[PDB]
GROMACS .gro file of C-alpha atoms in nm:
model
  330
    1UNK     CA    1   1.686  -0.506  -1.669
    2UNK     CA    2   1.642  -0.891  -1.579
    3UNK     CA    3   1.786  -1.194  -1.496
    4UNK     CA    4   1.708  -1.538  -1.481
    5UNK     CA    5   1.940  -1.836  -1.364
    6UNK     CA    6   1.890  -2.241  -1.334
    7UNK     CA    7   1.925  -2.337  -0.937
    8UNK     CA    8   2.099  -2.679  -0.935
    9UNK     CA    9   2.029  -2.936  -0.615
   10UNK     CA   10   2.341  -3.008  -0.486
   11UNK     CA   11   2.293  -3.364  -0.396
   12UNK     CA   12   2.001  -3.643  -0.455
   13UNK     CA   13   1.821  -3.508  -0.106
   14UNK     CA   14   1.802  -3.131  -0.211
   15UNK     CA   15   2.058  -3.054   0.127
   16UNK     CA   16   2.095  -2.681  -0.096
   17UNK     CA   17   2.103  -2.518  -0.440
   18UNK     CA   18   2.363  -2.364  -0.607
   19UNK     CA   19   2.361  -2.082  -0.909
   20UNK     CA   20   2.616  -2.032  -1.136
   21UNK     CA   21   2.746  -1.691  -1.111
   22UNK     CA   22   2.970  -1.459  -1.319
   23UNK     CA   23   3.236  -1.274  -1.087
   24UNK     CA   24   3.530  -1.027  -1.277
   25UNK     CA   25   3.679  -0.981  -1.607
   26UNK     CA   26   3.739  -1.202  -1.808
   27UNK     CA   27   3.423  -1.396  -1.611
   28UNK     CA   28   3.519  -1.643  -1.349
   29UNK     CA   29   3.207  -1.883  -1.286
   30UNK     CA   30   3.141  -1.983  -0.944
   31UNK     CA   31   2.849  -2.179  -0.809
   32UNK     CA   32   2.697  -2.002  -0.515
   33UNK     CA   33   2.431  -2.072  -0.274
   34UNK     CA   34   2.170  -1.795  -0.307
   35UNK     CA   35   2.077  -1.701   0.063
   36UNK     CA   36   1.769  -1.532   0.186
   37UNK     CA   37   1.895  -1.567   0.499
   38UNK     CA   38   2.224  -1.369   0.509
   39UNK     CA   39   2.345  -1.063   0.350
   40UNK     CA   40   2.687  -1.141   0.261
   41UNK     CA   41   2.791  -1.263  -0.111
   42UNK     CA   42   3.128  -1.431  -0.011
   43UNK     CA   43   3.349  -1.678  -0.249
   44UNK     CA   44   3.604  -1.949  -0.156
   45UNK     CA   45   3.918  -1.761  -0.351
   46UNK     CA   46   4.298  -1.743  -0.424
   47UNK     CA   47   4.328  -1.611  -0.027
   48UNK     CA   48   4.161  -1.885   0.115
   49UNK     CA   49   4.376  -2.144   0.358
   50UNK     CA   50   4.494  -2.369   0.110
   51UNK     CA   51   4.390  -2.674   0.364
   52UNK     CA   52   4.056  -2.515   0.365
   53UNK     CA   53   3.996  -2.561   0.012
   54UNK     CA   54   3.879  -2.925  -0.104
   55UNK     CA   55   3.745  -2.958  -0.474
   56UNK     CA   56   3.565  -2.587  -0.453
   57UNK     CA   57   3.599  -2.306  -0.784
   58UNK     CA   58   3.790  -2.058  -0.632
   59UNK     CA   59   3.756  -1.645  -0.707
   60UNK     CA   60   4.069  -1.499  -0.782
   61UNK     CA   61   4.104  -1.160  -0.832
   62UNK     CA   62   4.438  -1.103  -0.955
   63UNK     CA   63   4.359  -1.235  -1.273
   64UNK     CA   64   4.002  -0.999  -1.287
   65UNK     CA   65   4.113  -0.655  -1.459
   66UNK     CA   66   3.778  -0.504  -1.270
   67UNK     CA   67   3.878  -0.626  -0.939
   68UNK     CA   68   3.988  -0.346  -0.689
   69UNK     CA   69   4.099  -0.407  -0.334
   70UNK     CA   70   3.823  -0.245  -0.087
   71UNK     CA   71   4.102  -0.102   0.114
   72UNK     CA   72   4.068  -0.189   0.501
   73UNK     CA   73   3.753  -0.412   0.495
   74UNK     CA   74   3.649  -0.740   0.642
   75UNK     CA   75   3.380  -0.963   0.723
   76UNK     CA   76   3.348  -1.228   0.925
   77UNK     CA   77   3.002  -1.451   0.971
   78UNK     CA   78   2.826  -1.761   1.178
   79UNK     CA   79   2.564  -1.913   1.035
   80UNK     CA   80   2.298  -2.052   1.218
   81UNK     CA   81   2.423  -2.382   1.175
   82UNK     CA   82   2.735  -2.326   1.336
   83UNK     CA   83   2.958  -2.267   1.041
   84UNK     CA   84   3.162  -1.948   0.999
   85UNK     CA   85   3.424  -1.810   0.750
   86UNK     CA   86   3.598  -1.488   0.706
   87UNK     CA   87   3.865  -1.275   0.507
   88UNK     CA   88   3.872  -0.920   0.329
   89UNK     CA   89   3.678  -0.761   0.006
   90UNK     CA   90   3.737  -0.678  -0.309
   91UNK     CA   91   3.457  -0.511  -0.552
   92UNK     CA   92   3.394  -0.650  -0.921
   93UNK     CA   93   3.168  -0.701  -1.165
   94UNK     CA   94   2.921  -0.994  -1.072
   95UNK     CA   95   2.655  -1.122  -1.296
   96UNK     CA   96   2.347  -1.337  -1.275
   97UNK     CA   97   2.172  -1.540  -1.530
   98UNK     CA   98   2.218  -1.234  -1.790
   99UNK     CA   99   2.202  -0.895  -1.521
  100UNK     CA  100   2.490  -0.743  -1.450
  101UNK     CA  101   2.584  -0.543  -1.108
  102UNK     CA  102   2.916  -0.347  -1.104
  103UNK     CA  103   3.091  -0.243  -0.820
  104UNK     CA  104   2.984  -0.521  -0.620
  105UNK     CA  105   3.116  -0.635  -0.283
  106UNK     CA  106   3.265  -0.992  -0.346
  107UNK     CA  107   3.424  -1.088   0.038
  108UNK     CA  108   3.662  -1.296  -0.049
  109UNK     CA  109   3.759  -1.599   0.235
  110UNK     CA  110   4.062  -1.657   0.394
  111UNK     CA  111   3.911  -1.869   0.653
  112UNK     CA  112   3.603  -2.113   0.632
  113UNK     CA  113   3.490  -2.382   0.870
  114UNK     CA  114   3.501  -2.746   0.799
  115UNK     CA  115   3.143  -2.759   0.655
  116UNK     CA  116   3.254  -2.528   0.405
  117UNK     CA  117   3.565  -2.722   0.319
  118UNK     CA  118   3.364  -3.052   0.314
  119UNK     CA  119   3.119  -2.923   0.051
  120UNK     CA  120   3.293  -2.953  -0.266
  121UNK     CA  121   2.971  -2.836  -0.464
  122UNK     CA  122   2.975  -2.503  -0.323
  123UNK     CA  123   3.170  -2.231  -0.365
  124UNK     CA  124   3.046  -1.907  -0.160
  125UNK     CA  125   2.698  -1.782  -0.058
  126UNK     CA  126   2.523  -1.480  -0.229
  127UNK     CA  127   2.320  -1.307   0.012
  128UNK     CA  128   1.963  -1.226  -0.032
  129UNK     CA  129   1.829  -1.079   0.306
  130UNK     CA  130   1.849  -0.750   0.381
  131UNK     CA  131   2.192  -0.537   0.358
  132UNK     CA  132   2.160  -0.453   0.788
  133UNK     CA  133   2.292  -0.787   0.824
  134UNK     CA  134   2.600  -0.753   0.592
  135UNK     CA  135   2.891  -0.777   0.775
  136UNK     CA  136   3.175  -0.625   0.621
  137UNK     CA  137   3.389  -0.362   0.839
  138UNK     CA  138   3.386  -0.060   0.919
  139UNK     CA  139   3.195  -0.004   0.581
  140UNK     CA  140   2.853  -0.201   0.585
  141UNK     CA  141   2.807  -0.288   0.231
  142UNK     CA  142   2.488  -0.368  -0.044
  143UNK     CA  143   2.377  -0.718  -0.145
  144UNK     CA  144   2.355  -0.817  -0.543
  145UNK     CA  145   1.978  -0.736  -0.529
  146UNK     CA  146   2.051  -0.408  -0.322
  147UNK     CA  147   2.250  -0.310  -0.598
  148UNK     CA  148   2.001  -0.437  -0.898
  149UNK     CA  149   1.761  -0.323  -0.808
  150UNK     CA  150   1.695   0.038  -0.909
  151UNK     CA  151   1.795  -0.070  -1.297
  152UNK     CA  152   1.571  -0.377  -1.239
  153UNK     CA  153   1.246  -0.378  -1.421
  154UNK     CA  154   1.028  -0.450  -1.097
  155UNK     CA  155   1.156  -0.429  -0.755
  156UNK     CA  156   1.179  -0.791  -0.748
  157UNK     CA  157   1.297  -1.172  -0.742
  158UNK     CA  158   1.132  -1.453  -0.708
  159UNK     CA  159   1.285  -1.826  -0.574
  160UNK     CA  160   1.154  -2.170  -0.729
  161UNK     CA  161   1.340  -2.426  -0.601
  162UNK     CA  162   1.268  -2.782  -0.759
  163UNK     CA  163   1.195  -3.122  -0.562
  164UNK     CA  164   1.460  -3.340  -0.668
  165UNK     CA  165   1.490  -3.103  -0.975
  166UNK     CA  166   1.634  -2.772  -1.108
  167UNK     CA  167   1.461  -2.498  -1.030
  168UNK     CA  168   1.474  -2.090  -1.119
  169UNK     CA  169   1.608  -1.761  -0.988
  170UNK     CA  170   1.430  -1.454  -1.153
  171UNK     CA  171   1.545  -1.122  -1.087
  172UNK     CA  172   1.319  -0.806  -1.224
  173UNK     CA  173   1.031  -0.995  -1.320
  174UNK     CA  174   0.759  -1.244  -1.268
  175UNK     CA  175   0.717  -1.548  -1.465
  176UNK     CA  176   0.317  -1.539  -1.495
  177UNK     CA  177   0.428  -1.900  -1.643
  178UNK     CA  178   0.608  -2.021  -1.322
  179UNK     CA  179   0.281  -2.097  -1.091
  180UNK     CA  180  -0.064  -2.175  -1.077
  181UNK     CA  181  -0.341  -2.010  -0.968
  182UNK     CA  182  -0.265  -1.651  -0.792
  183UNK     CA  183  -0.007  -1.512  -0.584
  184UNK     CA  184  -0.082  -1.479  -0.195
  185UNK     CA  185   0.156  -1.162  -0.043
  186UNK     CA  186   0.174  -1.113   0.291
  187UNK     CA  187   0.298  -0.847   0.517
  188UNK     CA  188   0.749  -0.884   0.588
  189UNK     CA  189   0.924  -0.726   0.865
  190UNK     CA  190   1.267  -0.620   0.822
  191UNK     CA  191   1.282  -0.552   1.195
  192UNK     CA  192   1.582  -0.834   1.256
  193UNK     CA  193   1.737  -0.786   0.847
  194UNK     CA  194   1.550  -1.137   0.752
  195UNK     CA  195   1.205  -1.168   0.515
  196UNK     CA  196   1.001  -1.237   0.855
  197UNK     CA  197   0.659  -1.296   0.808
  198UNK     CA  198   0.365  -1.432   0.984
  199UNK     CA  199   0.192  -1.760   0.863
  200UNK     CA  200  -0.190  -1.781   0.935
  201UNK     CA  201  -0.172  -2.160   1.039
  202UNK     CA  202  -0.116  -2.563   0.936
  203UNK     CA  203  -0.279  -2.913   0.904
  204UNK     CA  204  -0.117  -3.234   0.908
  205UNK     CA  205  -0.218  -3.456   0.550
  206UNK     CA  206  -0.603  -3.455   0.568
  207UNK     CA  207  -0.659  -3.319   0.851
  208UNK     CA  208  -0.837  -3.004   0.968
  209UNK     CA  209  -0.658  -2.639   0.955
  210UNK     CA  210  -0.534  -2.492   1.289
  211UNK     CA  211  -0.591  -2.104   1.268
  212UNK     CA  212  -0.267  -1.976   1.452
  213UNK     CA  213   0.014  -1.722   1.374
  214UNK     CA  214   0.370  -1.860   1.315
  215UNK     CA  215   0.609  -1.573   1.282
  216UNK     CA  216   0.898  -1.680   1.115
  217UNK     CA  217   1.167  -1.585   0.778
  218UNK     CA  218   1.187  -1.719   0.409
  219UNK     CA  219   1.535  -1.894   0.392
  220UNK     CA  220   1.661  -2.002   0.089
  221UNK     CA  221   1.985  -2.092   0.292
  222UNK     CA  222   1.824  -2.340   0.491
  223UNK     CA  223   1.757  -2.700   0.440
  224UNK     CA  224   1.449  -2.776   0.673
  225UNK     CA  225   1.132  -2.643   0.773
  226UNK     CA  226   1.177  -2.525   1.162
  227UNK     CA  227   0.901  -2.483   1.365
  228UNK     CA  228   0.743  -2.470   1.693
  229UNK     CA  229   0.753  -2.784   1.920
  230UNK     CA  230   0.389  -2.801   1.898
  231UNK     CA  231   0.361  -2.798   1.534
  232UNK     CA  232   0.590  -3.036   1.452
  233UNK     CA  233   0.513  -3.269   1.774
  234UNK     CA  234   0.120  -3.265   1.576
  235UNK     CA  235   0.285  -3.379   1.229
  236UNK     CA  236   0.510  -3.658   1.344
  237UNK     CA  237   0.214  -3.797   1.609
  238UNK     CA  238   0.089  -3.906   1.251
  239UNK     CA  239   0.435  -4.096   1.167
  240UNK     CA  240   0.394  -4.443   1.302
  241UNK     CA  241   0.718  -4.485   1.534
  242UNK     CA  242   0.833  -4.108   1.448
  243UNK     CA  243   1.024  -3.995   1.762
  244UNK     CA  244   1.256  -3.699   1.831
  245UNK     CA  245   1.608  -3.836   1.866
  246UNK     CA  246   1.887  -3.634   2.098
  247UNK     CA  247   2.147  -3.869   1.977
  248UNK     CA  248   2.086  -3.786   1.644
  249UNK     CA  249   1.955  -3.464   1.656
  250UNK     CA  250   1.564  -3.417   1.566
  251UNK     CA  251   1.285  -3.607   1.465
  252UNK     CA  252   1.370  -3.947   1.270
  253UNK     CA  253   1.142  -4.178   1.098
  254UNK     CA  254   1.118  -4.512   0.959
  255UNK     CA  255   1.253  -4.528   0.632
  256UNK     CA  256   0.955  -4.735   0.545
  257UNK     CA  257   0.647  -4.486   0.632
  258UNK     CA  258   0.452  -4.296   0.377
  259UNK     CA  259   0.465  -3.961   0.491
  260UNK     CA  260   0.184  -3.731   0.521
  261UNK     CA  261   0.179  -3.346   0.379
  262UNK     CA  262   0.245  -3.045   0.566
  263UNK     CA  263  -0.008  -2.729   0.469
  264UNK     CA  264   0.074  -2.417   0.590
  265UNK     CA  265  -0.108  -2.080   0.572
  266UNK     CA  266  -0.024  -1.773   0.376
  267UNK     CA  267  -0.320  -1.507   0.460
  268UNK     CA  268  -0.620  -1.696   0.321
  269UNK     CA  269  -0.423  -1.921   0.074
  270UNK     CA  270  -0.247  -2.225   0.136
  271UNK     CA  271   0.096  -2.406   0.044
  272UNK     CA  272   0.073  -2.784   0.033
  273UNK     CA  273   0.411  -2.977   0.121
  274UNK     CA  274   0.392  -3.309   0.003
  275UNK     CA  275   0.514  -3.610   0.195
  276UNK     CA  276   0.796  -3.683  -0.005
  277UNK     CA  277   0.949  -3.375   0.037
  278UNK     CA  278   1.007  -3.415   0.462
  279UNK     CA  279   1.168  -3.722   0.399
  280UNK     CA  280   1.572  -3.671   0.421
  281UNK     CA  281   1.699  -4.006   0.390
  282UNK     CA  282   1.839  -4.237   0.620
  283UNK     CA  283   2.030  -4.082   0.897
  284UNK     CA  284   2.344  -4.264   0.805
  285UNK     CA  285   2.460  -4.512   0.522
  286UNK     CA  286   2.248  -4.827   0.537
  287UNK     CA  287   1.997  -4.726   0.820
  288UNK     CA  288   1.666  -4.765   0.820
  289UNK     CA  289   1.573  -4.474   1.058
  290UNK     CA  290   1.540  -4.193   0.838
  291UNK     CA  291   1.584  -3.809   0.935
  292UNK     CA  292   1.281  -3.582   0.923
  293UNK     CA  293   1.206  -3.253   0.690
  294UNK     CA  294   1.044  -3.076   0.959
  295UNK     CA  295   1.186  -3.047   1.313
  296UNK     CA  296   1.168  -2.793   1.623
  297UNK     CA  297   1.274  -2.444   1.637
  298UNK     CA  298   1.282  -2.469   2.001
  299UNK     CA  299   1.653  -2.402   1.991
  300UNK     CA  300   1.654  -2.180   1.737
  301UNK     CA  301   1.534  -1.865   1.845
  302UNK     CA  302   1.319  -1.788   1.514
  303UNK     CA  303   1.097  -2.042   1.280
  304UNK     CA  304   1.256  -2.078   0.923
  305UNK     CA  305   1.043  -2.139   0.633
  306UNK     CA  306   1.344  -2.311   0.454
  307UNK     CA  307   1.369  -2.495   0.145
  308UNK     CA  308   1.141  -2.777   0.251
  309UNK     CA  309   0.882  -2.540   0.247
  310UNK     CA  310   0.949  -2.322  -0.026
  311UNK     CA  311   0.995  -2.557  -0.264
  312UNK     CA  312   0.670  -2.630  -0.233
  313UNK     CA  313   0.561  -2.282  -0.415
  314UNK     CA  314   0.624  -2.020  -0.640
  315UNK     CA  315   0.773  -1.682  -0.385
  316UNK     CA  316   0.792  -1.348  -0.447
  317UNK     CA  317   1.085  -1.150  -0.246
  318UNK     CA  318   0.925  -0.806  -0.317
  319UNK     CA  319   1.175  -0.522  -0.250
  320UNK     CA  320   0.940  -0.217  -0.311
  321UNK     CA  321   0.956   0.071  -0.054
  322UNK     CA  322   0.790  -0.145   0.190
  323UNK     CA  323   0.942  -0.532   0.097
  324UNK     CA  324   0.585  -0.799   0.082
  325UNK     CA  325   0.636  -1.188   0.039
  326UNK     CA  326   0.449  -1.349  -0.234
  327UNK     CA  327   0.349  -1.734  -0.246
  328UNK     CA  328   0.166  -1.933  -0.526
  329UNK     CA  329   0.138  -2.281  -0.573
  330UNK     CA  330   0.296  -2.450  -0.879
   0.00000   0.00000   0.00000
């Protein structure tokens, strides 16, 4: 089997992406955030705090004949961003863009945090990391490509996420249509649950490449691209009257630069960022300081490839017996 789904921007700077995705019988539709940085598929639902709801589809599984109570679990998660939600699970049918996983663990909220609530456009994450990281309780449970992906026709899906555009989640296959050139894998470890990977190196615009290894994970869930002080301290040296800002939280720009790209290395290939795609808008309403695409993982803990990054290419999320990332340009 296969699927294939449209990935939607949720707002004119590409802050996320949301899928449409079928959940129960008859189908209840509910945009989700595909994350390749979590493990959980959780909806907004009938359960959830009614103050906690604002504008969000909700799941509600009385009214889905497959729906079955998974007796005594619950899940409860933080995101590195410092939102959380929680609640129980039911299983259900879920579909996505045409493939179809039954028995699926759908954790349904009864909490979220105000992030959550503030974001009408989205209505639960689906998980795309590996299933170690699930949280449910006592009984870990499977992600929606854990559970594809032995009837899938390739151990596979792949993530291209538009620039101020729609963009594509294939599951089974590879769209030989979807990129240019050839596909660049690279080694993953699933040591810490995440598609970790090493990065061979960077230049800033036209400048020279720095052979060095970045370790960090392909996150779908994540705006920005996070990296080390270093790095980022090279690309915004280039920014005339860039500066990192601890009132407002990381790098900011003036909204009237022209920014340069951001390369960065997969093995011997290379993913070119254009300018455009760092820039994030003025840091409030009217301003013209505008907040920066790339900032420091210093705080972090990990460097995250997110969506600034990877919607710069065509990536492969291979799940065979030993998972590989794949990156082409498009």
């Amino acid at each position: 089997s296969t699927g294939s789904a449209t990935t939607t921007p949720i707002d004119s700077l590409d802050d996320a992406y949301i899928t449409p995705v079928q959940i129960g019988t008859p189908a209840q539709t509910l945009n989700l955030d595909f994350d390749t940085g979590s493990s959980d598929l959780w909806v907004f639902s009938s359960e959830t705090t009614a103050s906690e709801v604002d504008g969000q589809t909700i799941y509600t599984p009385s009214k889905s004949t497959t729906a079955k109570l998974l007796s005594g679990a619950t899940w409860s998660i933080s995101y590195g961003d410092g939102s959380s939600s929680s609640g129980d699970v039911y299983t259900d049918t879920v579909s996505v863009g045409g493939l179809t996983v039954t028995g699926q663990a759908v954790e349904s909220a009864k909490k979220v945090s105000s992030s959550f609530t503030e974001d009408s456009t989205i209505d639960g994450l689906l998980g795309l990391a590996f299933s170690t990281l699930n949280t449910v309780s006592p009984t870990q449970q499977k992600t929606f490509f854990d559970n594809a992906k032995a009837s899938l026709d390739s151990p596979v899906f792949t993530a291209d996420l538009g620039y101020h555009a729609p963009g594509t989640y294939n599951f089974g296959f590879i769209d030989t249509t979807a990129y240019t050139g050839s596909i660049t894998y690279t080694a993953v470890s699933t040591k810490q649950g995440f598609w970790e990977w090493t990065s061979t190196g960077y230049a800033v615009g036209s400048g020279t490449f720095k052979s060095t290894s970045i370790d960090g994970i392909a996150d779908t869930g994540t705006t920005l691209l996070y990296l080390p002080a270093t790095v980022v301290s090279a690309y915004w040296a280039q920014v005339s009257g860039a500066k990192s800002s601890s009132s407002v939280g990381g790098y900011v720009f003036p909204c009237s630069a022209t920014l340069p790209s951001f390369t960065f290395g997969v093995g011997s290939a290379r993913i070119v960022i254009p300018g455009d795609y760092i820039d994030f808008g003025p840091i409030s309403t009217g301003s013209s300081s505008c907040f920066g695409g790339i900032q420091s993982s210093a705080g972090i803990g990990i460097n995250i490839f997110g969506d600034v990054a990877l919607k710069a290419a065509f990536v492969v999320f291979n799940g065979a017996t030993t998972p590989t990332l794949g990156f082409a340009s498009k």
